């Protein structure tokens, strides 16, 4: 192109975001930052879930990983704000908020656990080997496992540990969320084509933003896509396990919003 353009683009050749993609990137990034509990100040003012909690699984589950009701209660007491923040994030993306209300509900139920799991995973702390839930509650593998998640907890920790080396920034987390949200692998959607077109726009903007960032680890983009796949598997194991939870435990132990999201 122009001399200046060429000068500016010398150390690049992989496609950068277009100006339209930068707009999309900026809105998603801000939507995430404004809905992500604690402004990058999470590790300072976080508290550990007491070591004596989450050591006593005694409610049976079909897969044999039992549940500690006390730990389950501690986790579910803070889950309502966590789900609400995912909803707030989604409502801030124009391509989501212009969908029929019914499609918005289906998309949210479809991705809620995928996004929450990703938000917990990016707060993995290698030193203490904990996840920080909602940026306030540091939990150990055993505690999160026994408090209801079973093997889903091991999957989240594994993801969190592997994501450490990716050094994701807010934009990359935000775009993963948008890609998870705008999925047509749900049933009963009306605006299938429009949702797909939106996902494709986010995916391309995401690939181009990845080029822009020039991460030091190789094969970054396909590596990141593989993490999207892991997150969707985490979502599915959670949906399966939630069904069993509901068979074993009375409704009064589940906050209303938690039941609503993970319904069918
Ligand atoms: O980290 C925050 O932003 C969000 C965060 C908050 C919660 I509480 C959550 O922990 C869960 C999730 C599902 C579940 O059935 C049980 I029992 C515990 C996840 I993992 C992530």
């Amino acid at each position: 192109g122009s001399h200046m353009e060429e000068m500016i683009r010398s150390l690049q050749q992989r496609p950068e975001p277009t100006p339209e993609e930068w707009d999309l990137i900026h809105i998603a990034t801000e939507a995430h930052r404004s809905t992500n509990a604690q402004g990058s100040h999470w590790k300072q003012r976080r508290k550990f879930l007491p070591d004596d909690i989450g050591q006593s699984p005694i409610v049976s589950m079909p897969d044999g990983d039992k549940v500690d009701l006390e730990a389950f209660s501690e986790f579910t007491k803070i889950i309502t704000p966590a789900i609400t923040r995912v909803v707030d994030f989604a409502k801030k993306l124009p391509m989501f908020s212009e969908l029929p209300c019914e499609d918005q509900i289906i998309l949210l139920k479809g991705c809620c656990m995928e996004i929450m799991s990703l938000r917990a995973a990016v707060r993995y702390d290698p030193e203490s080997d904990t996840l920080t839930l909602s940026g306030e509650m540091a939990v150990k593998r055993e505690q999160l496992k026994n408090g209801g998640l079973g093997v889903v907890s091991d999957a989240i920790f594994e993801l969190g540990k592997s994501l450490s080396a990716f050094n994701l920034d807010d934009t990359e987390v935000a775009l993963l969320q948008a890609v998870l949200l705008m999925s047509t692998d749900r049933s009963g959607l009306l605006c299938v084509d429009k949702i797909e077109k939106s996902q494709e726009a986010y995916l391309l903007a995401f690939e181009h933003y990845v080029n822009h960032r020039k991460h030091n680890i190789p094969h970054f983009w396909p590596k990141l896509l593989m993490k999207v796949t892991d997150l969707r598997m985490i979502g599915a194991c959670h949906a399966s396990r939630f069904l069993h939870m509901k068979v074993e435990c009375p409704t009064e132990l589940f906050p209303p919003l938690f039941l609503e999201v993970f319904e069918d």
Side-chain angles (χ1 to χ4, degrees), residues 92-150:
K92 280 160 182 281
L93 308 179
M95 291 190 294
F96 173 87
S97 63
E98 77 187 353
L99 294 173
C101 297
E102 291 77 6
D103 277 5
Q104 299 185 30
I105 301 300
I106 290 165
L107 294 187
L108 282 167
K109 296 183 172 164
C111 75
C112 187
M113 179 59 174
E114 296 162 0
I115 293 175
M116 287 185 303
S117 292
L118 169 63
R119 287 174 157 203
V122 307
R123 301 194 209 89
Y124 173 72
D125 178 57
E127 229 217 346
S128 57
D129 188 34
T130 59
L131 297 178
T132 302
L133 306 183
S134 301
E136 64 178 73
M137 180 197 280
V139 303
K140 294 282 196 175
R141 301 159 166 270
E142 178 202 34
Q143 295 177 310
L144 189 61
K145 183 180 179 175
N146 292 335
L149 285 194

Side-chain angles (χ1 to χ4, degrees), residues 75-86 254-258:
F75 301 148
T76 56
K77 258 138 66 161
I78 62 171
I79 202 161
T80 295
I83 290 155
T84 303
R85 285 185 250 106
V86 181
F254 299 80
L257 187 59
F258 185 40

